[PDB]
Chain A
Amino acid sequence: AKVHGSLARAGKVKSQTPKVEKTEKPKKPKGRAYKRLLYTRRFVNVTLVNGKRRMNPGPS
């Protein structure tokens, strides 16, 4: 109400998160080549259907 925000209490989970450096991958394609790439990912080499279909099978 009247001031009790207490700016010591602030974005503390921005302060105490351990930030590693972002990684480095090879360059993905773009333009039509990325839409070429996601074409085959659906109905050409569909990987793990686990009953009927699942797109990104998080490992379990």
Chain B
Amino acid sequence: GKGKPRGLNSARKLRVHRRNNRWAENNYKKRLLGTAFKSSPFGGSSHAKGIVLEKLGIESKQPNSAIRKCVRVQLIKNGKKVTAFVPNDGCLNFVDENDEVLLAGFGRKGKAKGDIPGVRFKVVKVSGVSLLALWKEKKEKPRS
């Protein structure tokens, strides 16, 4: 037909041919080479807790504005260095200094979304206080 030989006794020249041309997939190499935890600072899983060394603040690119106020966190298990991001109407005062703090990824297989450069993660709770319950403050602040 077009290459790809239609011999009846010809399985191996189509079976070596498949998983030779399987390496071109954008995610198949990150499956079996194990690359998901030789970088990308978890063990190929959801979350980990870090430590607030200090914070910082980035201004976005064009066309965008309104500095986005991220935080500087070193992570617990590999000593790797990636920052976080704090999405609320404030609560940067709520995440105080030198706390343990739980992380989460932005959804797009890493790959910082459209306008926050140099970021990889967001925060789901800070020393187990569930800042969703403190931004929309349906909680007190337990001790931190």
Contacts and interface: CB of A to CB of B under 8 A. Distances in A.
Contact between A and B in the complex (any CB pair below 8 Å): yes
A3 B90 CA distance: 17
A14 to B, nearest CB: 4
Contacts of B93: 7, 10
Chain A contact surface mostly: loop
A9 B88 contact: no
B62 to A, nearest CB: 16
Contact of A4 (B57, B91, B92): B57
Contacts of A10: 69, 90, 92-93
Contact of A5 (B55, B88, B89, B91): B55
A5 B54 CA distance: 12
Interface of A: 1-7, 9-15
7 contacts: A1-B56, A1-B58, A3-B55, A4-B67, A10-B69, A10-B90, A14-B90
